[PDB]
Every structure is written in structure tokens, then in C-alpha cells.
Design a protein around this ligand. Sequence first.
Ligand code: HEM
Ligand code: HEM
Ligand code: HEM
Ligand code: HEM
Ligand SMILES: COc1nn(C)c(=O)n1-c1cccc2ccc(C#CC(C)(C)C)cc12
Ligand SMILES: CCCCCCCCO[C@@H]1O[C@H](CO)[C@@H](O)[C@H](O)[C@H]1O
Ligand code: FES
Lengths: 147, 61, 80, 380, 108, 55, 48, 109, 101
Amino acid sequence: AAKNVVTQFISSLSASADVLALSKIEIKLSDIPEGKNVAFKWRGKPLFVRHRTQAEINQEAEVDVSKLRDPQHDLDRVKKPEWVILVGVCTHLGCVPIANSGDFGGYYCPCHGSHYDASGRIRKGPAPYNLEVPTYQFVGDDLVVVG
Amino acid sequence: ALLRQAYSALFRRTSTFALTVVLGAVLFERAFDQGADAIFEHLNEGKLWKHIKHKYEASEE
Amino acid sequence: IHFGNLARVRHIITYSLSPFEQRAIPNIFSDALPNVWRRFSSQVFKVAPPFLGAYLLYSWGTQEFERLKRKNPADYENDQ
Amino acid sequence: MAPNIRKSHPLLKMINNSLIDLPAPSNISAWWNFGSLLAVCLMTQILTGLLLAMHYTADTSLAFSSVAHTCRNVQYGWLIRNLHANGASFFFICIFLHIGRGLYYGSYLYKETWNTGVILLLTLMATAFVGYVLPWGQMSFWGATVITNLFSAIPYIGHTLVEWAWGGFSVDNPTLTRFFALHFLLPFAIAGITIIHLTFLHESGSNNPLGISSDSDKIPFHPYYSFKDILGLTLMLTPFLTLALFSPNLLGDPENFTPANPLVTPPHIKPEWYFLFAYAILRSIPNKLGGVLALAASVLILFLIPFLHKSKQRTMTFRPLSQTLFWLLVANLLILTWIGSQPVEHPFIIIGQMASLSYFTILLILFPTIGTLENKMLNY
Amino acid sequence: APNIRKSHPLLKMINNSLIDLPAPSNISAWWNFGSLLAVCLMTQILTGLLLAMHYTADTSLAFSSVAHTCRNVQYGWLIRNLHANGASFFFICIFLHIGRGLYYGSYL
Amino acid sequence: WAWGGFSVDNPTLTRFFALHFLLPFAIAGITIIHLTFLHESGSNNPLGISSDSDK
Amino acid sequence: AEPEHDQRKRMGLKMLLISALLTSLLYYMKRHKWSVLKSRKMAYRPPK
Amino acid sequence: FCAQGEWMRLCTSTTESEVKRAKNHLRSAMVAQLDGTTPVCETIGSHLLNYGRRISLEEWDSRISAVDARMVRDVCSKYIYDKCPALAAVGPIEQLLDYNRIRSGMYWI
Amino acid sequence: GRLMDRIRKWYYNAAGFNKYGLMRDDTLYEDDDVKEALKRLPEDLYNERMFRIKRALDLSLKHRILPKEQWVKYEEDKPYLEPYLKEVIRERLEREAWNKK
Ligand code: HEM
Ligand code: HEM
Ligand code: HEM
Ligand code: HEM
Ligand SMILES: COc1nn(C)c(=O)n1-c1cccc2ccc(C#CC(C)(C)C)cc12
Ligand SMILES: CCCCCCCCO[C@@H]1O[C@H](CO)[C@@H](O)[C@H](O)[C@H]1O
Ligand code: FES
């Protein structure tokens, strides 16, 4: 009896049904064409899912792994090259970037500069790290489940 | 000698002492407030609404 | 009950006077102040030192921080 | 039963044996005034706090404005709000002098009174930490975020204990609501535990500044100390009110006049003065986990003092080497406090680790060592 | 003192009111409501806190916060039931406690 | 004064929540006093006669 | 930002005056009672 | 505590019953001081020396009979109420303490 | 040479209990050993220590000290309790050691 009541009460404090309901989001890769960045709402913060053309994935390989503050090549960030999924928040002071623009074609944080490439890495600017890459995976050649 | 008078009439009998504190408080409040407010307003001439109020107080439109 | 069990005391006499027969704050100059000085003196060289050292450290670190925000002309001497 | 009803009555008897006929050393100084202040301080917080809670709304969408409505519409809400917020600092100022006094006069040799004391400090800290989050301003949110995220640094059971505390994935409404509950509850635990604190204390009675038995000279609490404390109360109360009435926001971050925004990190996320020193020690150890332990240890270190006493004498009154070491430590703390308010950059970074290092050394190694050495110089 | 149950400033209190405390050998079941009342109290406070961590005191959200607690909070519905019904158990107990005292002149 | 206005409204709800959170604690506190007075005499028993002979 | 601005300050005035008055009074009183211990004299008279 | 208590009663709530009896005691007392030739001589020697004449029991009695509650209260108040007394204590006196506490026992019944 | 002596005499004045008219042994923290030792003191040495201590406490509350003339001098400080205290500890260590064996 004790084990149960405690179990029940303790658990009453963990995330509730409504909250877990937004725990994760599933996006359809079919709605996102290449060369076009689509942003969705995940956990109150913007979620970046850009369809990388075979062209953009190239500009990517051409990146000096040991010439960036947060040293990481596309390899370590994504999974499917044509697919990049980031957490739309500048790693500096929590602002939301702007895709396609910037000195590296990726994203630009209009707060203090912080330029991010097409792979979401801090280039020119104050930001310390590169846009965060959250947990996820794929399901069928058209669905992805972030979170 | 007020001190003696005071002691005898006011501070000796504990019942009269309380009475003195109570009636003493009432008078102290009335006075203390008036004085403080006076010091505050003087130190702030022409700044308070009390002062400028007359300009729009039935003298406009 | 804590009064009467405290200690075994023998042969000590004490004299005291009602509060109404004496002055509340007596001999301010002949006794009070001299001692206030006495006390201050006796302690100053124990307390003051580490606070003074703390100050300097503060002062240095503060100023040193601002100096590092200023520009060093020797970075633009051949920038034509 | 007994002649006077002050000794027979089951209740008055309790009031009497702890505030009237209670034996107190004839020579305790002002440093012994902080106990009552702490107590009075506590009643004041609870009183103002309740008055504020009757107008607050614990909901992200209404917190900030409920507080504003309280200041702008409620009769004297602004005053009550000031008193409560500033009352917190008075509380910590008092607790630090209370703690100091005990360290300098070896009061901690009263182990249980000491230990309950450390628990009082800890509870108090938690109380303010949750209270601060309530107005839901920028610093309210980010402090809440920064500090609760630390637990995710504990191995395996980390990311969970955290998502359990928040009630979700980030400091959000479910966190605010449980913090209000906690903030309402802890002060009572404090009052309760204070009764225990004074109970153990009364087993021995008070210590005194010369640290030698004062049974040879004891005086009744009333009127001696009842008067001395009331005087102490008015003397501290003056700076308090002067601050809370003339410079209401001196000690507070302006960033907290901006409604919390999860998408905007403030430039300088620093705590209220009373937590600065700890925040400094925290950042002294780069490594999420080490820094945490260092933080824990910083306050928990207090539980070891009683066992690190080597002197043959109780107080530091007649121990000049210990006295400078003692004031060195105090100064040490001012510096950590200062470091806690600065960014994480040179020279502050190095100075930080020094002060943090010296802090633990002074208490773990020097104090016990100088103490022994001093014993030898008395030919003991 | 020999055993720490009598010397210790705290255990001593626990001992003189729940262990070595002198009680009549013949008290009946009507003397059981005191403890129940007590236990009952600890239960209310406990469930009450658990509920207060999900309630919102605002006319525009009170009703629904309670509903949100029952529908979304893990066992909120249980906790809610227990608290609400616990109130009655409390009163039932208090009336029997009062009765008992009137019938046996405890009020003396 | 008790409603905080002219009718039972939000200002009343908020102060009631505060009161509802507070009182149980006063109860627990007062219960300690209840049991304290009680222990002065000890419990009464169903026959209403001194039970010192059998405790 | 803070409408109470004026009332708050007017209040600070009242608080200081009263504070000044009460603190002095209580200091005297504290002293008056303690006078008994402050002036107290003792002596050790063993049957020596 | 009890003693000082009784003094406060004297100043604030004496009863005719109490004075009535107190007077009979006092009479038998003055009379008992003239029980013998030495004790009557002691009286004479003293009276003259102190009052500048002799005071007969007949007189003492006239004065003693005029005393009543209302009177006792006024006199005691005049000599005891709120006065700062003189205290002498000898022996294992640790439990008797503070002149302040004793002084405060000099007022309010 | 006379270093140890220079130092000790120095610390002795540095501390300053003598300004209260206290003997070094008067300032000892009263733990268990010291408490037993005090029970063995002869009636006269006990009442003397008692007065010295009560005197110091009165000076403390008064925020005064003794006139320089009355200060206990380093070389005139009588280690009245040290002898007893040392034996008390010796006796304890005997027992402690014997209950191990
Ligand atoms: C809400 C918190 C606290 C309250 C209300 C409180 C209250 C008191 C009171 C009323 C006293 C007696 C008067 C005095 O000596 O000041 C006291 C004594 C004491 N307290 Fe606390 N205290 C608190 C926190 C602490 C803390 C944090 C510690 C230390 C870790 C502590 C250590 C002591 C000790 C050891 C004594 C004995 C003093 C002596 O040497 O005589 N207390 N406290
Ligand atoms: C140990 C006692 C307490 C401490 C140290 C304390 C501390 C605090 C702190 C630090 C804040 C932030 C104030 C600000 O800057 O805006 C606060 C807010 C609050 N406290 Fe307390 N508090 C205490 C007790 C209470 C109690 C007992 C209640 C009522 C049950 C309470 C209710 C509130 C409320 C309603 C707020 C939000 C309103 C505001 O922001 O001013 N507090 N408290
Ligand atoms: C939260 C409310 C209460 C609690 C927790 C409480 C608790 C207790 C407890 C633990 C006892 C001892 C065991 C027993 O005799 O049942 C007791 C005894 C008693 N209580 Fe209460 N009580 C409560 C309310 C009251 C009320 C409302 C009354 C009556 C107006 C009352 C009258 C008594 C009396 C007179 C006794 C003596 C029993 C005897 O005859 O031996 N109690 N109570
Ligand atoms: C003497 C103990 C208590 C009694 C008699 C009691 C009784 C009740 C009652 C009559 C309700 C209405 C329940 C319903 O039918 O919807 C209620 C609601 C509530 N109580 Fe308590 N309560 C107690 C203690 C507490 C405490 C200590 C807290 C937490 C600090 C609390 C928090 C709540 C909350 C959050 C509600 C609203 C949720 C709901 O409606 O179920 N209560 N309580
Ligand atoms: C709600 O967060 C806060 N409450 N309070 C009162 C406060 O100062 N903060 C804060 C606001 C901003 C930055 C902070 C950094 C560290 C801490 C802390 C701490 C402990 C408990 C470990 C001593 C609190 C911060
Ligand atoms: C140490 C205790 C100091 C208490 C000071 C009490 C003074 C508060 O006085 C306040 O002044 C305001 C301005 O006129 C008025 O509006 C308030 O009604 C009045 O209560
Ligand atoms: S927040 Fe993006 S550059 Fe500063």
C-alpha cells in the first residue's frame, strides 16, 4: 500500500498529460522542399528544419573543422545530409535567427551579429556555440519526430 | 515642579499612566501629523497638485 | 528551575543602587569616551588590515578590467 | 498549586522559562541581539507575505501584473511589497551576523543548537529563492532557469530530478504554481524549526563573550534583555525603513521590471547580494558537476566547524592569531561577494578561484592549525 | 540518564506523549477519534498541498484549474477525491470526538 | 471589507485561498496546545473514576 | 513608474522623526535599567 | 514574591476586618510592654527621651482606635508604594535576584 | 636560546586575559576533563578562581578592564589547575586503554 500511494503522489508532480502532449513534434519532410528553410513551433521555441540541396551539402564539406569555436563537421550534427534540424535560438543571448541571409548564407541573428552557416554553426559574431541540434529521428521517407 | 506634579497626578497610579499615554497619543498624533505635512509642503512649494490646482480648477473652458 | 542550582559561590559581596538614585549615562567624558577610544585602538590593527587588503585587490582588479577594454595603439601602427 | 500563576500555569510557565525568569549571562554583547531580530524578522515576513499573497495570482499570464496591481491599486500594497522585499535582505544581513557571532565565540560548541541553525539557514535560502521567482520578471525567470538546470549535472538521475521539479521541460507555469506553494509553506517550517533551535539552546543556556562559565553571574532575561533587544530592534529597524522608504530599489535588479521572456537572455544573470558569494564559488570550478559540489560544500562546510575546533579556549577573545584569520575570512567573503557580481572574465576569473580556494583553506586547514599552534604558545 | 529515550531533549518529548505515557487500561473505541482527528489532519494538509500546486486562484481560472488537475495531473483525480472526501471523514470524526466527551464528561 | 469589494468576486477568492492555506497550520499548532493541557491530567476513562490504580 | 513617489517620501519624513524620538527614548530606558549592573561593585572577603 | 505581595495589598485593598483585628493585636502588644517594673521603666526612659513626655496606654488606645482601613491604605501608600527599597541578603541567596525585579514588586497590587 | 621564552611571554600579553585579572587556567574551556579537575581543587583555590571569573564577567558587561597595575604578570601566573587536569587525563587514558585490551 505505501509503495503505491507514494508512487502515485510522487508521480503527480511529474509532467501532466497536457504538457506531455507537446513533448514532441512530428514534421513531414514532404512539405519541405530543397533550398527552403521551414520553421515550426516546438516547446515554445522555434524549430528549424531546412531541406539541404546536394549543392548546399557541398559548401558544407568545405569547412575547416578546426577553424570554428564549436568544432564540428556536418557529420557530427545531422544524419541525412538533405536534412538539417536545429533549435532556432542564437547561442548568445536567446534571439531567433533569420535564414537564407548572413555572410554565410545560413542564418543571421539581428541582435549582435552572430552569423551561422548553412549547417548552423557560429561564424562571424559574439555567439559562443552553434545553433543547437535536438534529439529526433525519421519514420518513413516523409516524417520526422523531434523530441 | 511639574516633574513632581506629573509623577503624582500622572505616572504614579498605573491606571492614570495608561490614561496619560492614550490621551497623550491622541494629542501627539494630531500635532505631529500637521507639523510633518507642513514641513513637507513647505519644502515642496509650487510642486504639488495642492498648489497648482487652481489653474484648471474652474478657471478654464 | 534554573535559579538556585547554577553554582557553588562563597564569600562574594556586592553593592548596587536603585536606578532612580543614579545617572543613566554617567561620566561620558571622564570614563565613556576614553574607553571607546581604548577599545577602538586595541582592535584596529587586527580588523582593518585584511579589509584594507581587500580594498586594494578590488581597486586593482576593477581598474585592470577597464584597462583591458581600452585599445592598444600598437595594433594599428601599421594599418595604413 | 504554586504561589504565582506565572510558574504553575502549563502555558505561562513556558513563556516564563524562556522570556522572563530565564537565566542569561550578565555580559552578553550586541552580537547576541541577532537571535531575537531573526525571530522578529521572521514574523514580519510572514505577516507582510500573507498580506501580499492575498492579492497575488500564481499564473505566468498574471503573476507580473498581479504584483503590479498590488502596488498600483491595493491600499499600501506598494508599502507592503517594499517591506516584504527589503525584509528579505534584513533577514540575511541578520543571519550572517548571527552566524559570524557564533563562529567567533565558539557557540557552535553547542552542536545541536548549531546544527538546527544550519538547517534554518538552508530553509531560509530555499524560501527566498522560490519567493523571488513569484513576480515573474526577467531575473525571476532566468535565475530560476540557471540554478535549477544545475541538477541535470547529477549522474544518471539528473535530467529526471530536473524535469520533475519543473513539472515539464522548462521553467513554466507548472513550476510557478508549485513555487508559490513552497514559498507559502517553508516559512512555517522555519518557525517550527526555530522552536527546536531555542529548545536545544535552553539546555545549556547562552554562551558569553569571554567563553568561561557564567553561572557565577546570571541575570533574568526580563528586564535586562527584553529591553536590550527592543533597543536592538529599533536600532536595526531604522536603516531598514530608511532604505525601503528612500531608496526602494537600491539592492534590486532593474531587469526584474521586465516580464519574463524565455527568448531573451539577460546580459548579466547575477543573484541578489546575499547569494553572490555562493554564485562566485559556483563559477570558480569550470565543470558543471564540480561547481555544484563546490557550491554545496560552501554552505554545508558549516556542519564541520564543531569538529574543527582545536583551541583549549572557547572564544577568539584571547586568541589574536585566530582573530586576524577570522577577519581575513570575513574579507575573503566580501571578495567572493564582489566576484559574484562581475562577469566571467579576466581578472575576475582568477581572483575568483583564489578567493574560493582560500575560503576552504582558512576553515579546513588554517583555523584548526593555528588553533593548535596557539595552544602551544600558552604552554599547553 | 541510562536510555536515550528519556534524556534527549526531543525523544523525551516523543516518549512522554506516545510511548511511556500513562493511559487508563479501560478506554474504549470512543477514545480512538483523537488520533484519527490528528491523522486526518496530516492527510488533509498533505493532499491539500499536492492540490495547491496545480490550482490557480483567479475567478477566470479556478474552475478549470481544478478540472485540469483531475483530467491531466497524474492521479490528480484521486488526490482531489481524497481531499474533498477527507473533509467529511474529518467532521464525522470530530462529531464523534465531541459526543464522546459530552457523554463521559471529558469537558470537566 | 471581507469581500474586498461589493460582492463575492476575485478579490475574495484570492484571500480565501490564502486563508485556506493558512488555517490548517493554526489547527495543527492549536492541536499541540490541546494535547498539552490534556497531558496535565491524563485521559479520562468510561467509568469516570480515578484510573491511577491501573495504568 | 511609481505614483506612490510623493506619499512614500512624505512617509519617510514621518518615519525619521519618530525613529529619532523613539530610539533616544529607548536608549535611555535601556540604560536606566542596566545602570544597576553598570555601577555595581563587588568584593571578595574570605575568612582569611 | 508573596511578602511584597502583602505590602501591595496594604496599600490597595485593606479590609476593616483586617484592621479591626490588627488593632486588638496591637493593643495587647502595647500592654504586654508594661508587664514588669523593668519594661515599664524602659518605656518611661524612652518616651521622655523620644517624645519629650510619657504617653499613657489610655492615649495610645485613643489613637489606635481612630485607625481604619481607608486610613491604613493612605499611610502605607505614602510610605511604600513605588519606593526604592533597601535590601540586605546573606547566605545561599542565588535564587533571590535582581534589584530591578524587586523594585518592580513595589507597585500594582 | 631564550626564543621560546620570548615568544610565549609575547603571546601571553598578546592574548590579554590578564587585563581581566584572569589566570591562564581560568580561561580554559570547561569540557569533561576540566570539569572533573575543577572538582578536585581545594576549597580555597576554588573560591579564588570563582571570584576572578565573576570579576571578569562584571568587567566584560561594563566594557572595562583592570588598571594596568592589577594586570597579572606573565611570570606571576599560577597554573593552579594544570597539575590536576593532567592526572585526570592520565587516569582516563589508563581506563580507555584497559577497556580495549
Ligand atoms: C531563522 C534563523 C534563526 C533564528 C530565528 C535563530 C534564533 C536564535 C536565538 C533567539 C538565539 C538566542 C539569542 C542569541 O544568542 O542570538 C540563537 C542562538 C544561537 N543560534 Fe540561532 N537562530 C537562527 C539561525 C542560526 C544559524 C544559521 C546558526 C548557525 C549555523 C545559529 C546558531 C546559533 C547558536 C549556536 C546559538 C547560541 C548563541 C550563543 O553562543 O549563546 N542560529 N539563535
Ligand atoms: C522566510 C520568509 C520569507 C522570505 C525570506 C520571503 C522572501 C520573498 C522574496 C525574496 C520575494 C521576492 C520579492 C520581490 O522582490 O518582488 C517574495 C515574494 C513573495 N512572497 Fe515572500 N518571503 C517570505 C515569506 C512569505 C510568506 C509567509 C508569504 C505568504 C504566505 C509570502 C508571500 C510572498 C508573495 C505573495 C510574493 C510575491 C509578491 C512580490 O513579488 O512581492 N512570502 N518573498
Ligand atoms: C483537530 C481537532 C481535534 C484533535 C486533532 C483532537 C485531538 C485529541 C486527542 C489526540 C485526544 C486524546 C485521545 C482521545 O481522547 O480521543 C483528545 C482528547 C480530548 N479532546 Fe480533542 N481533539 C480535537 C478536537 C476537540 C474538540 C472539538 C473537543 C471538544 C469541544 C475536544 C475535546 C477533547 C477532550 C475533552 C479530550 C479528553 C478526552 C478524555 O475524556 O479522556 N477535542 N483530543
Ligand atoms: C483542515 C484541512 C483542510 C480541510 C478541512 C480542507 C477542505 C477542503 C474543502 C472543503 C475543499 C473543497 C473540495 C471540493 O469539493 O472541490 C478544499 C479545497 C482545496 N483545498 Fe483544502 N482543506 C484542508 C487543507 C488544505 C491545505 C492545507 C491545502 C494546501 C495548503 C489545501 C488546498 C486545497 C486546494 C488547492 C483546494 C482546491 C482544489 C479542490 O477544489 O479540490 N486544503 N479543501
Ligand atoms: C529565482 O532565482 C533567484 N532567487 N534569488 C533570491 C536570486 O537571487 N535568484 C537568482 C537570480 C539570478 C541569478 C541567480 C544565480 C544564483 C542563484 C542562487 C543560489 C543558491 C540558492 C544556490 C544560493 C540565484 C539567482
Ligand atoms: C519606528 C516606527 C516608525 C513608524 C512611523 C509611522 C509613520 C507613518 O505615517 C503615515 O504617513 C503617511 C503620509 O502622510 C499617511 O498617509 C499614513 O496614513 C500614515 O500612517
Ligand atoms: S543573441 Fe544572437 S548575436 Fe547576440
